[PDB]
Write a protein that binds this ligand. Structure first.
Ligand SMILES: Nc1ncnc2c1ncn2[C@@H]1O[C@H](COP(=O)(O)OP(=O)(O)O)[C@@H](O)[C@H]1O
Ligand SMILES: Nc1ncnc2c1ncn2[C@@H]1O[C@H](COP(=O)(O)O)[C@@H](O)[C@H]1O
Lengths: 89, 89, 105
């Protein structure tokens, strides 16, 4: 009935690091997340068949802090974060 | 070679899938992709329905999804996208 | 501190039996990675797709997620055209931001 801007993260990583991730989201004040499982992917590390994708809608001011919190991680582990623009009602 | 369109990401409990797809059909949506067996915290057995739709279906669709999400878990993310041949949509 | 850069993201939806055709196109174009979401269901112009119903799971619909520099979008769609004229499926092109362009281009 009224659309508001927001950001949406797609966070793709190895499932063994999921707790760390969802845990880190919680501390930034993210209010929810949905997780897509049993993925397969091709990367610099060359192949998988696992991996998960965490979808998180978050206010734009949280983007910075989250990317910063995930920095040390992706600099030592496989994975990627895609930042989207979205609207929610 | 690309035209503008909108893409919905509809996250909700699986028991309500038919309610959700009836809304898409009844509204004129020509197609949809369903991602299954999700997990979440968020109020996003969860599924995500991906629907590419002309912008002028967005209002009407959200209108139907409103009373539902006031009484049930879930969310709707609206995205901007481009496609090659909109007629298909 | 962390700068963001513009990029495009494809969602490619098609029958699983054509996965190799699709990924060959990505590899040839110079796409550096992709993520595949499996065992999907869908409604198309003609019929339902329910991979829970498939006998060989490598036959259900899949969605290929590919982050790609904008200048690969044209070429990729060009290859995906004749395919989608003769087969089920669709491509959605998204705008996105990433922290590390070099990982994608
Ligand atoms: N508007 C849409 N939004 C999301 N997914 C779609 C849409 N249209 C088609 N799809 C996906 O593509 C699949 C095949 O669609 P389509 O090519 O129209 O099939 P068919 O050849 O049987 O008409 C669908 O099952 C669905 O997953
Ligand atoms: N360009 C990309 N597009 C989509 N997914 C990607 C991309 N690059 C990496 N990924 C995902 O991230 C995983 C790890 O890649 P890497 O970080 O290179 O090890 C891959 O298996 C993919 O699932």
């Amino acid at each position: 009935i009224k659309l508001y801007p927001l950001k949406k993260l797609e966070i793709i990583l190895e499932g063994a690091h999921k707790e760390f991730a969802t845990d880190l989201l919680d501390r930034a004040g993210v209010k929810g997340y949905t997780i897509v499982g049993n993925l397969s992917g091709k990367g610099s590390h060359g192949m998988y068949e696992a991996l998960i994708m965490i979808i998180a809608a978050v206010p734009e001011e949280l983007v910075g802090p989250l990317l910063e919190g995930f920095q040390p991680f992706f600099e030592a582990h496989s994975g990627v974060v895609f930042v989207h623009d979205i609207q929610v009602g």
